[PDB]
């Protein structure tokens, strides 16, 4: 904890230097931060071990950094590692050695796995363990006794209090191993789900499942892969391995349809088995081996309609061997977390790309679903060609003097509309769409403010999607955008920042955002991150632009929301000005047009 003169954590009195440090690429500070080198000959071996024990904090192209947390270690033991194996290899990798504090810390968070297990059977939840002593210790805890239902020893626990039990179990240093023994579970009938030979999983996809199925039993946890990496295939493959009834929880009506199509494309399951449970319609969820729905539908708290209530009654009174939870990072929400207890599932698999949230509830996924089983490196996949290369940028659009006059003075939350509706910003978006369309690029434009989305959509005469648009109508636009050459640019709102699969969307633009939501930014860039047909690894196939207003609060949010992407190596080149704009017939070229726009923005309030 010694601090140098330059506010630096002096760690020279703490650890020594290894003589053969040149070959060893790892640093290990007593704070737990681990700085691995990406140019070392032994990087590949170190990364896989390190990513498991420590969740990456930043992974630039040269020197990566990781942090050691109790949850990060608890994932290491679940996959198959052991304290002796981790510390010995860590010492072998360390070019400075492991400080005594970290060495004991690693040991502390490894003698907690396997002590207690959670088993669901016959619609009943039981706390299983082979050591009566640890169970007795738990019983001493008040809340643990409170949630109790009102050799190996097991006591039944009420479903409604599973969350509180799990949260306290971690707090008692006794994580519950919610591990599903699907291969030794004949009670639940085996479904006809099978992986067609045409579907081959990429090395990272298979590696993620290997951690999930390291032993015969199936592990429940959160699997993180970059947007467009193919999490749909991994989720489908997990169901194929389980061969039991599978529940898939998307994020919206668009998510389930793509989940439905991916199952058909990447699995032999017949169309009759696949079903949807959404407000738009339902494919007889009462009879179906694979159910696809949305958190909103299942997590709905108010009284459900008769059509939905009947399905909900069936869902609660069922046993699911695998509950795939797409967009896991939304789970720790107050109500969406309830969907875990409402539905009965043995193994909960979580798929997501941006395991980040502006609150501190992202850690709750450790016990709500399980430890982070895997986390692929974005740059590693980007160079391999599995995900398109993106040249992120931040177009600096100077604020209009008439607008800035009002923005500086106004502070009653009306600023957002003012600098979202920047005529200078509009022209950059207008020019960018025109230039990129001439290059046969499929443009996507995002805007958190629907007002801004509508203003830009009609003015450019381009399709726009947001809340009120019916599921069929928005689905139609995507199909037109996917295939119709005429529809080269689409406008989307907060609805389509996640789960939208547009493989051919080379270009992306963003004219607005909801504060510094790193999750929103990384998710939004995901739409165009899908692998392209004629993609070349080092040709910058895709592009991302985040229009911002200079000398405005949007600058602070623009830097805030770039934190996650830069942590993965993405560099956000700054574009002060765009060439060729002057010679272009763009809108708002006269003060009268800009003057008219400002009045309308003020009127909206």
């Amino acid at each position: 904890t010694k601090v140098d003169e330059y506010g630096a954590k002096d760690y020279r009195l703490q650890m020594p230097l290894k003589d053969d440090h040149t070959s060893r690429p790892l640093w290990v500070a007593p704070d737990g931060h681990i700085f691995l080198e990406a140019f070392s000959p032994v990087y590949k071996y170190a990364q896989d071990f390190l990513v498991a024990i420590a969740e990456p904090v930043c992974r630039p192209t040269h020197v990566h950094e990781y942090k050691l947390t109790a949850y990060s270690l608890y994932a290491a033991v679940s996959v198959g590692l052991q304290t002796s194996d981790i510390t010995e290899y860590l010492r072998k990798l360390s070019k400075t050695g492991v400080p005594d504090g970290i060495m004991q810390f690693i040991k502390l968070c490894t003698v907690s796995y396997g002590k207690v297990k959670l088993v669901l059977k016959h619609n009943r939840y039981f706390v299983e363990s082979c050591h009566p002593d640890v169970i007795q210790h738990l019983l001493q805890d008040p809340v643990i006794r409170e949630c109790r239902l009102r050799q190996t020893v097991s006591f039944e626990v009420k479903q409604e209090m599973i969350e509180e039990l799990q949260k306290r179990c971690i707090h008692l240093e006794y994580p519950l191993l919610a591990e599903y023994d699907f291969r030794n579970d004949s009670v639940n009938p085996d479904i006809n789900i099978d992986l067609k030979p045409t579907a081959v999983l990429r090395p990272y996809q298979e590696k993620s499942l290997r951690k999930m199925f390291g032993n015969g039993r199936a592990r429940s946890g959160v699997i993180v892969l970059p947007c467009g990496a193919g999490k749909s295939l991994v989720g489908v493959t997990a169901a194929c391995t389980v061969r039991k009834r599978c529940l898939v929880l998307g994020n919206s009506a668009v998510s389930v349809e793509q989940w439905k199509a991916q199952f058909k494309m990447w699995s032999t399951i017949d169309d009759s088995q696949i079903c949807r449970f959404t407000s738009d319609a339902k494919d007889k969820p009462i009879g179906c081996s694979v159910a696809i729905s949305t958190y909103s539908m299942l997590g709905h708290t108010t009284k459900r309609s008769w059509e939905a209530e009947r399905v909900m009654e069936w869902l609660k009174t069922q046993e699911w061997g695998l509950m795939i939870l797409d967009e896991v990072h939304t789970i720790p929400a107050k109500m969406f977390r309830r969907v875990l207890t409402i539905v009965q599932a043995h193994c909960k698999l979580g798929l997501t790309a941006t395991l980040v949230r502006e609150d501190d509830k992202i850690v709750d996924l450790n016990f709500l679903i399980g430890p982070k089983l895997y986390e692929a490196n974005w740059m590693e996949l980007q160079n391999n060609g599995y995900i398109a290369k993106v040249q992120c940028a931040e177009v600096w659009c100077p604020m209009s003097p008439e607008f800035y006059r009002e923005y500086v003075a106004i502070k009653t939350k009306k600023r957002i509309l003012l600098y979202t509706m920047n005529p200078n910003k509009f022209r950059a978006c207008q020019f960018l769409i025109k230039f990129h369309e001439r290059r046969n690029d499929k443009i996507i434009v995002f805007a958190d403010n629907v007002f801004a989305l509508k203003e830009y959509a009609i003015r450019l005469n381009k399709p726009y999607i947001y809340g009120p648009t019916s599921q069929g109508e928005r689905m139609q636009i995507l199909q037109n955008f996917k295939h119709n050459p005429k529809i080269n640019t689409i406008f989307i709102s907060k609805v389509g920042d996640t789960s939208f699969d547009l493989p051919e969307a080379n270009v992306l633009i963003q004219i607005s955002s909801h504060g510094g939501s790193r999750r929103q930014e990384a998710q939004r860039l995901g739409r165009v991150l899908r692998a392209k047909k004629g993609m070349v690894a080092e040709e910058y196939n895709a592009f991302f632009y985040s229009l911002v207003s200079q000398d405005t609060q949007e600058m602070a949010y623009s830097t805030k929301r770039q934190r996650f992407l830069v942590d993965q190596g993405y560099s956000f080149k700054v574009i002060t000005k765009l060439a060729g704009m002057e010679e272009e017939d763009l809108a708002f070229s006269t003060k009268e047009e800009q003057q008219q726009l400002l009045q309308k923005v003020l009127a909206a309030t």
Binding site: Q391, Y540, K573, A579
Partner: peptide, 15 residues
């Protein structure tokens, strides 16, 4: 063969 625009290709900073 659809090269990148000037702004993305080279720095736009005055310095």
């Amino acid at each position: 063969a659809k090269e990148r625009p000037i702004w993305l290709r080279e720095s736009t900073v005055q310095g």
